Each structure stands twice: as structure tokens, then as C-alpha cells.
Amino acid sequence: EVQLQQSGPELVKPGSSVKISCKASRNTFTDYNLDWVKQSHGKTLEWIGNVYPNNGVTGYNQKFRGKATLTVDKSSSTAYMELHSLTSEDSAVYYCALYYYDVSYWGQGTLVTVSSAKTTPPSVYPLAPGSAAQTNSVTLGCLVKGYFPEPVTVTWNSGSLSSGVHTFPAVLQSDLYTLSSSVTVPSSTWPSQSVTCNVAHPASSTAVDKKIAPA
Amino acid sequence: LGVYVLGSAMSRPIIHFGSDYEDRYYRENMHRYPNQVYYRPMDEYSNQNNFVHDCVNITIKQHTVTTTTKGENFTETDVKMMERVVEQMCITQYERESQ
Amino acid sequence: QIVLTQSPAIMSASPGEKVTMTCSASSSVSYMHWYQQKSGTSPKRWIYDTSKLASGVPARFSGSGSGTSYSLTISSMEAEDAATYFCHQWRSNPYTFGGGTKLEIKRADAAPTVSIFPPSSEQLTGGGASVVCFLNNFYPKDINVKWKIDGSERQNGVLNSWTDQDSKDSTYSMSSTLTLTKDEYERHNSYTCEATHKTSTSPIVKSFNRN
């Protein structure tokens, strides 16, 4: 029933600082603990520190002292992590995690990109076939090209479509990301029904919907 | 308060609870718990368990009033954990008083 | 501080198989915690206090160990269990994590299904020309792609990306994108995407003419 909402992705200049939040949404516990954790290149996990939100006590990993400061706003159930003086080693996903006896919940994570480059929105291009015309099901896609920073999220008809969707990890090339997503639907439904990918780029606040018409 | 003995400091022991959640909570909060105990003189008690019982209540009372005029709230988790470590501390104090 | 070493680092198991992975510690801990992470999502506590299951964790999982040596066991490997598993200790500050055990499931081999897409007019109209190739739902993951342009090979300006093992059918998928200038594209007719894989002795080919 409890849920941890973390604030959204951040693009920060080196030397700057940034504050991210984690609010315990439905919570009923008195004494729980909140850990903060970093994950680098979707692999290695490091404990940063914790706080008991109610009232006061705060622990740091010695390695992150002077780099992270943890505080809590107890009237609005929100915990904050301030990151000081960012470098590229600070780009990562940052999680908060709640513990109380047997129960544990992680937030969905907050991607922080430390970079001098400026935001760029994606161009979205629909991928239809034109003459390669079906047996069985049929494949479409969307190409999402030349954006920065991560992430973007891609949905098909808004969630309505989630069977035979592959969405591929972005890859950096020349200082901008490019990703793609495919979807496979039955010959019969296409072109007759109307297919859309919806791309959202938080860091720039573009949300584009691009319809897939037939070549 | 002139009726109590105030013992000298001792190292706070580590207590274990049966879950990692509590063991960790304890270790992380224990600096906020006391490191000396208040007791009534030994010559009022005919045995250890009675000495210990009194030492626990009095010590906990004084610690809770003196840190609440310093804006420290102790949760119910806290008093339950002070119950346990003050008990060990009062037993050690009892041993100090018996040679 | 306390260094947690997990092994093996990567393991493959077939369905129904008993699987065991170990986390060992440079000094004693009282309890060990294990976490599951599937790709794209965040870690989720899986076993806590050495051997208790977090909620939602299937019965086929178990945990044990003491001192410096801990294990996570799956009595009977299922496709959904394919993930990365980490151990974690709360004995002393700093709390640390192991390096992970990546667990994959074996399946029967499968050829990919290949779609090539020419570029959208929207793209051409604003400078570029990306031709795109999807290679979907194959196993095992070792695949290789090569692009062709009226017979000539092209190895630069090409982006490749793989998904991870699918929870449902346990396959892999991949896209390959060939980016070109509009002009260079306007001067060739025949665009071929070409895949080499265990399931075929000869290449798998998809192509379109610019007409």
C-alpha cells in the first residue's frame, strides 16, 4: 500500500548541485528507515546513507560525505538527497528504499546525467512497411533519434498495446541518443485500426504522438 | 534525587534482537541511549533481580526527562530498546558493587 | 569494508533445474539479504534475514548460510526467474552489495524474424535517411548483422542494440540502424539487411528497392 515516488530525471552541469526527492506516499509506520542507493551503468550498487524520518538520525557512507547531504521534511513525508559538486562519476540512477521489519519498497529511481551538453528533443519517425505486405502478424516500429538526455519512454496506443512490443536500449552515438521500438500486431488489424507510438521526453517536456500510416 | 547513586560510565553493549532490522536500528541509534545508570544503594536490596528492576526504571526516567528538555523524542521502539540495554548495564553495575 | 563476492557471475540453467548461487563475505555477518533486479526496473528485496521470503516471492526460492558463506537456491528454474541477483549486508557501515549473479534460462534454438524499414518521408524532408532492421525473438543471443547497398558492404554509421532475455518466451531481440545522408541514399537502389545465426547455415536476408 505504501509507495515511494521519486522526483524525475535531471540534467546537471558539472560543478553544480542537484536535489532529489523521495516521498512516502501512503505510509502508516512510525519508525522506518530509508536508505539511499546508487547504481552505476545499470550494474554496481552502492549504499550512500540513510535517515530515520521521524525523528532525526542520519548515517553516511564515508565515501559520500561531502558529496551527499540527507534531510527530511517530516510534515510532507518527503526525504531529500542533495548532491554537491557533480562530476561525470555522479551520473547514475539513485534509489531510495524504505524498510520496516519485513517490509521493503524501492522507488523507481532517479536518473541523473551530469553533462555540459544541452537538452535536445528527439525526432520521432514512424516505421511502416510499404510493399513487404504480411503473412501471419505484421511489424511496425518507431525510431526515436537524436535526443539528449535519457530517458524517453515509448508506449503504443498508450498502454493499450503491450503484446509483442520490444523497446530497445538507447545507444549514444556522437553525443546524442537513439532508440527504437517495434510492435507486432495481426495482419487483419492493420492498416484498418490506427496505430500510434507516444514518445515522451521528460528532460525537454516534449510528448509526441506519431501515427503509423501505410508507406 | 540525593537518594540515588549515579554510577560511572561504562561502554554501551551490543544487544541482538532476532532480526537484522532491529540489530541495525539499535546499532545506529545506541549513541542516544545512556552510558551510566542511576540506582538506589545496594543495602536496600535482598537480591539482584530487584536491584536491576529499580535501576532500569529510574535510569530510563532520568534519561527521558533530561533529553526531552533538549528536544529529543524517544519512540516506543526506543524505550523498548533502552529497556534492554539499561538492563545489561544495571547488571554490570550490580557486579561492580559486589567486588 | 565487508566485501561481498558472488558466484558465479553469469549462469545459464534449463527449466525445472535446481540452481544455486553463493554470496561470500570477507568477514562474518549475522544475516544476509538478497535482491532481484529485472532489466529496466528497480531492485526488489527477495529474501531477507537470510532465509525469509519477501512478499510476492514464489515458494521455490530459498535462502541459507551463516558466517561468511550464504546461498540462494531455486528449487526449480522457471522462465520468469531469469534476472540479476544481488546479496547485501547490514553488519557494518558501509553496507555493501555483491557484484551480482546474472541468471539466464536455456531454451530450444529459434531463428529471428527480420523486418527492414525504409526511411520516413518526414526524415528525408529534414536532412537524414535512416534505414532500420529488426531481428526479433531469436535464441541463442549470438547473432551478426551486415548491411548491403547495391552489393557493397557498409560498416560505419550503424547502431546496434539488444534487448535482454524475455521473461515470457526467453528470446532475444535486436535492432540495427544504418544512418546515411539523404544524398548518398538518393543515389542507391538496393538496401539489404543480412543476418547470420546458429539456426541457419546460410544468411537471412531482407531488402527493399528505393522504388
Side-chain angles (χ1 to χ4, degrees):
Chain A
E1 173 66 303
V2 199
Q3 202 204 115
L4 300 183
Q5 305 165 356
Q6 290 184 235
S7 49
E10 297 289 337
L11 162 61
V12 208
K13 301 215 167 183
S16 270
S17 66
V18 77
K19 181 170 271 186
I20 75 202
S21 56
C22 161
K23 71 114 70 210
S25 130
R26 236 47 267 279
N27 151 42
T28 334
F29 321 113
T30 301
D31 312 282
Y32 59 96
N33 179 227
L34 245 220
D35 281 333
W36 287 89
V37 179
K38 180 189 193 174
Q39 179 161 59
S40 301
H41 27 242
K43 164 97 288 188
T44 116
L45 285 159
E46 291 175 286
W47 178 74
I48 302 188
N50 66 316
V51 62
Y52 291 85
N54 147 18
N55 162 33
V57 178
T58 303
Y60 298 90
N61 179 331
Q62 158 157 346
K63 174 177 169 181
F64 288 99
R65 285 178 158 285
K67 168 58 64 168
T69 287
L70 315 173
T71 56
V72 156
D73 182 353
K74 61 173 305 212
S75 68
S76 81
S77 303
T78 307
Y80 298 101
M81 178 171 63
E82 185 185 3
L83 293 165
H84 307 284
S85 199
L86 296 199
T87 71
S88 18
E89 305 297 7
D90 300 317
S91 308
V93 186
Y94 288 95
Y95 292 105
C96 59
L98 180 150
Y99 297 97
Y100 175 76
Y101 295 78
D102 58 303
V103 348
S104 180
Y105 290 109
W106 291 48
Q108 70 286 355
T110 293
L111 180 58
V112 171
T113 305
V114 181
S115 168
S116 205
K118 187 160 279 158
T119 285
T120 313
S123 306
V124 180
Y125 300 125
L127 302 171
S131 293
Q134 82 93 25
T135 56
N136 181 261
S137 296
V138 66
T139 311
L140 308 182
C142 271
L143 184 60
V144 186
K145 159 157 173 48
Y147 65 91
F148 176 93
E150 280 269 67
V152 292
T153 85
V154 185
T155 62
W156 289 89
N157 299 350
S158 305
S160 275
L161 250 275
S162 38
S163 323
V165 163
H166 308 287
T167 283
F168 301 87
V171 28
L172 189 36
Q173 212 256 71
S174 265
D175 211 346
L176 299 174
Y177 290 101
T178 300
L179 90 66
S180 58
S181 176
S182 78
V183 68
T184 303
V185 310
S187 303
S188 41
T189 74
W190 207 82
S192 70
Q193 308 306 78
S194 95
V195 177
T196 296
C197 80
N198 325 287
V199 185
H201 186 236
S204 90
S205 306
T206 12
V208 182
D209 318 301
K210 200 66 228 182
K211 187 187 208 182
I212 319 313
Chain B
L1 229 176
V3 77
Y4 299 113
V5 178
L6 180 51
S8 43
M10 62 190 82
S11 55
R12 306 163 176 90
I14 302 301
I15 278 82
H16 298 286
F17 294 84
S19 62
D20 215 15
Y21 185 79
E22 292 169 288
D23 282 10
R24 182 182 167 186
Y25 181 103
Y26 174 79
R27 213 165 54 239
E28 287 179 347
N29 283 273
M30 75 187 289
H31 57 104
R32 291 165 59 224
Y33 305 153
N35 69 359
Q36 46 197 320
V37 301
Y38 275 102
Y39 54 107
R40 294 193 148 262
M42 293 281 292
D43 57 3
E44 297 171 16
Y45 298 96
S46 68
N47 79 289
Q48 189 178 313
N49 299 150
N50 290 156
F51 170 90
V52 167
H53 184 255
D54 278 354
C55 179
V56 170
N57 293 326
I58 303 150
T59 302
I60 278 177
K61 206 217 163 173
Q62 295 311 131
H63 195 69
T64 37
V65 305
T66 72
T67 25
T68 48
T69 75
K70 296 180 195 299
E72 264 231 44
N73 53 318
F74 291 115
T75 52
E76 198 93 47
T77 303
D78 285 322
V79 320
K80 173 277 190 96
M81 295 204 179
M82 280 190 266
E83 269 165 2
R84 216 77 86 70
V85 70
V86 173
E87 178 172 50
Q88 277 314 303
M89 290 198 297
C90 295
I91 289 167
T92 305
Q93 196 71 28
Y94 184 86
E95 283 162 357
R96 269 155 164 193
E97 299 280 27
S98 336
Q99 243 53 158
Chain C
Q1 258 356 60
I2 292 185
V3 171
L4 298 175
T5 310
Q6 289 183 246
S7 77
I10 163 155
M11 179 172 7
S12 83
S14 52
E17 282 194 25
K18 186 172 209 272
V19 169
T20 288
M21 69 188 71
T22 58
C23 173
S24 59
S26 54
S27 23
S28 269
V29 301
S30 299
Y31 307 95
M32 200 58 79
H33 312 276
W34 291 86
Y35 292 77
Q36 188 192 72
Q37 178 167 47
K38 293 167 157 302
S39 96
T41 58
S42 75
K44 180 148 71 227
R45 193 155 69 173
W46 212 243
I47 289 175
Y48 67 91
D49 288 5
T50 298
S51 70
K52 309 185 164 192
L53 319 195
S55 84
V57 170
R60 75 178 166 269
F61 284 86
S62 54
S64 48
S66 60
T68 47
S69 193
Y70 289 88
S71 64
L72 171 50
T73 287
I74 309 171
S75 66
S76 165
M77 183 61 187
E78 302 294 351
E80 317 80 264
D81 304 334
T84 297
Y85 301 80
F86 300 98
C87 54
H88 184 221
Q89 58 88 192
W90 290 352
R91 177 63 185 259
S92 49
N93 176 334
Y95 313 126
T96 46
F97 284 91
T101 294
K102 196 183 177 67
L103 172 54
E104 309 194 290
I105 199 183
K106 275 176 298 222
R107 39 156 307 140
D109 309 343
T113 341
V114 182
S115 316
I116 187 173
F117 295 80
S120 55
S121 37
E122 321 200 339
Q123 192 178 16
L124 292 160
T125 305
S130 293
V131 180
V132 192
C133 202
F134 291 135
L135 297 95
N136 283 349
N137 298 97
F138 58 87
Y139 183 96
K141 55 211 130 157
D142 331 311
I143 214 200
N144 203 260
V145 182
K146 204 180 59 145
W147 288 84
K148 252 62 176 301
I149 291 176
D150 296 288
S152 260
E153 195 214 346
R154 178 54 163 276
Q155 185 198 170
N156 345 260
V158 152
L159 291 195
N160 300 125
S161 187
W162 292 254
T163 63
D164 230 306
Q165 201 175 34
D166 190 87
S167 312
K168 160 182 253 55
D169 68 2
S170 300
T171 62
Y172 297 94
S173 290
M174 190 217 185
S175 54
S176 184
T177 306
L178 170 60
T179 302
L180 292 184
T181 75
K182 188 203 200 297
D183 331 57
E184 178 161 54
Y185 178 83
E186 291 242 310
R187 252 174 291 90
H188 287 296
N189 215 318
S190 200
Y191 293 83
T192 301
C193 175
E194 187 189 299
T196 284
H197 193 236
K198 163 183 289 246
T199 58
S200 192
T201 207
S202 15
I204 321 189
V205 157
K206 287 287 181 162
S207 200
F208 68 88
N209 331 61
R210 202 166 41 70
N211 328 34

